[PDB]
């Protein structure tokens, strides 16, 4: 019950090739590239106690196309899947770079932070 | 460069139905015009003297233009019908050391140079 008055999201490390989501009954969307995450915000359509997750993988898609690595064609949600939950106003992405000197001695860091609200 | 040759290609006028200019250009403005008179026959070639001033570090640029002696049929006294210029003197350029200091700032993604009351 406490995760409510928190902004909630469903992490999908790897699919291959394609997946359709549903969350409670309802279509919440898709995603295609098969090595790179998915990620969704479900704080709206999820609710307190039981809900359910269904999900339909597809081997073969428009995707395919550009998946044609020499090595065996396999399917399936083939990497981890988990729920977290962020307070409303929260960090979503950091960028650190490092530069050094002539003399490679002395170091610079430039620090970009990225912020992002949600009705805080 | 006092001395300049004119060549008359009209197949039946004389020159001195003409107004000659001659004008003397101090980096880009002028600085003394002449009027004057050159009897040519059609085909003669005929030399003009153009006393010269002393010159400075300036760019020197001459101007030799013939006009209209008074109105025609076609066009109004003072139109110019033919014109040549040359270079009398190229200018002496400076080069000058500079005492003055220079800031610089670095930071992620600029570098910051100051210079007066410019930043670059």
Redesign the interface.
């Given at each position: 019950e406490d995760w409510f008055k928190k902004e909630i999201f469903l992490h999908f490390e790897g699919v291959r090739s394609f997946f359709y989501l549903w969350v409670n009954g309802k279509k919440i969307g898709f995603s295609k590239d098969s090595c790179t995450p998915a990620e969704f915000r479900l704080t709206d359509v999820l609710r307190p106690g039981k809900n359910l997750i269904t999900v339909e993988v597809l081997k073969w898609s428009d995707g395919s196309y550009l998946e044609d690595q020499d090595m065996w064609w396999f399917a399936g949600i083939y990497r981890d899947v988990y729920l977290y939950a962020l307070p409303k106003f929260h960090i979503r992405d950091v960028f650190v770079?490092t530069?050094l000197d002539e003399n490679y001695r002395n170091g610079?860091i430039?620090?970009?932070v990225e912020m992002r609200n949600l009705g805080e | 460069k006092d001395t300049y040759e004119v060549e008359n290609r009209y197949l039946f006028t004389n020159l001195e139905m003409f107004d000659g200019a001659w004008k003397i250009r101090k980096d880009g403005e002028v600085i003394e015009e002449k009027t004057f008179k050159i009897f040519a026959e059609p085909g003669e070639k005929r030399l003009l003297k153009i006393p010269l001033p002393e010159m400075d570090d300036s760019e020197y640029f001459l101007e030799i233009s013939f006009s209209l002696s008074e109105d025609t049929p076609w066009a109004e006294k003072g139109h110019v019908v033919a014109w040549e210029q040359f270079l009398l003197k190229a200018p002496a350029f400076e080069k000058k050391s500079i005492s003055d200091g220079v800031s610089l700032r670095e930071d992620g993604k600029h570098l910051t140079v100051e210079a007066k009351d410019t930043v670059y």
């Open positions: 770079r530069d610079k430039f620090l970009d | -």
